[PDB]
Amino acid sequence: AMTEKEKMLSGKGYYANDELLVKEREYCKKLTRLFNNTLEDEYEKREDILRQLFGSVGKQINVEQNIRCDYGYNIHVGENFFANYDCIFLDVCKIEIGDNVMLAPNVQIYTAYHPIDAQLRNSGIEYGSPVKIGDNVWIGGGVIITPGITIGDNVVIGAGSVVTKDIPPNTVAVGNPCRVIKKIEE
């Protein structure tokens, strides 16, 4: 007998209005508010809040202001994580990110989605699928990543890409939808 949270985490249909999920989201927005309200020189305070917010963080992290998260604990980040202005991590499911990954401004990672069927959707049933980004990845400004996507090691995503399909390692990919355009040496 799974709870709503357990359904959510394992990619099954769940109701986000579940009391425990509502509370977790509220806590997330508290840490997120504190992070976003720090003054420019409060570097160590922001790092602390990240370590209380994210599921896991490396030795070095550098995240620019306004972040948006839903849960926090589903975001797992490797060494030397960098995210620029105003990224959003809609982390209904795991958002797993490797080492030496860097997000330009306005990168959006969406793990949540809904039934295409209107009636099923209106009943409030909802889903997630995790996102996985490998090591040594650079994601350009305004990139949107959809649920269930994995991006391989050693990838560069061009600005404004909408990633609807998995991206194999050692490539440069751009576009809406995002397509590989070039291979890179390992």
Added chain:
Amino acid sequence: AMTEKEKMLSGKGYYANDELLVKEREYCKKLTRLFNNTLEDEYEKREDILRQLFGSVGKQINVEQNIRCDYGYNIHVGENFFANYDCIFLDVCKIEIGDNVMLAPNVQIYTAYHPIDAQLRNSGIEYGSPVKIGDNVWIGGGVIITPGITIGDNVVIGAGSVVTKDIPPNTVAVGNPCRVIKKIEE
């Protein structure tokens, strides 16, 4: 002899620097500031502000923080409206939204536009065209909707779409520009 506001509402050229429009916009930003500054647990306060801001609201509304509006009163929303993080409703003209509509994060609805002619444009003459979204519509993250668009009932718009043409009911549509890709049963 129409006022600037009357010209604006009916899709005619108008000057946004009109004194009355300037004041209405200022009031809008006041409510909008208050909404955006509420703490995470202030659910009822946010709902109240929405009811003071929007032209009309249903019994249930759920709008996530940072909203951007220009007027407020031009936004008319049906039952069970949901908008996620950081949507923007540039409501120079009517933005009419049906029942059971849900916006993912960063959905942008732009009703304002300008003359293509540089000289006419520089004179400050400006336009709007209303946007209409039907019942039971789900709009994905980072979608942009342009002026004068209507989206039919029972539609799903894919993440990152730029909607430049009307979308017929009972379809899934994605892309830049946004095209129907599949039909759905009613």
Added chain:
Amino acid sequence: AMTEKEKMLSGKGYYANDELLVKEREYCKKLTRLFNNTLEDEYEKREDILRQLFGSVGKQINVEQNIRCDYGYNIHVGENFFANYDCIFLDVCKIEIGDNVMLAPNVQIYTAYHPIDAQLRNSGIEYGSPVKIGDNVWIGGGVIITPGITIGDNVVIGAGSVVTKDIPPNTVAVGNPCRVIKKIEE
């Protein structure tokens, strides 16, 4: 023997963690915070802060709230500049903008980029290329402009465009990637 800042400005590889650049960025975020925290009626205060922030400003400027900048002094704006809600000017290099230019909401101008090579990139070496927008240009909502782009006089960019190539004057261009679709009379 160029400093890191000098390397940055002239389009050469540089380390953003240079002590002087870090401080300049912090100052920028201070002015930017003050700008973004003004109340709706504080028109003259916002204008003042812009004049302290931007490298140059014309007689008239009208910039809507939340701006994001990195340096400020690299942003050089002509007469009658208008930017709507939540634009971002990632001004690692010069962002030069002509007279009578108007940005819709969420216009993003990115001058910063990185090596495609993972090892070079991980060493922290980074680049910029300046962006130039001519006179009498109207840029639609959610447009992304990449580094080194120039946009000619008398251009209109459609909503949601990703500008990866230079745009010649007297044209309307839209799309991802952004392509000319029509010529305009001068």
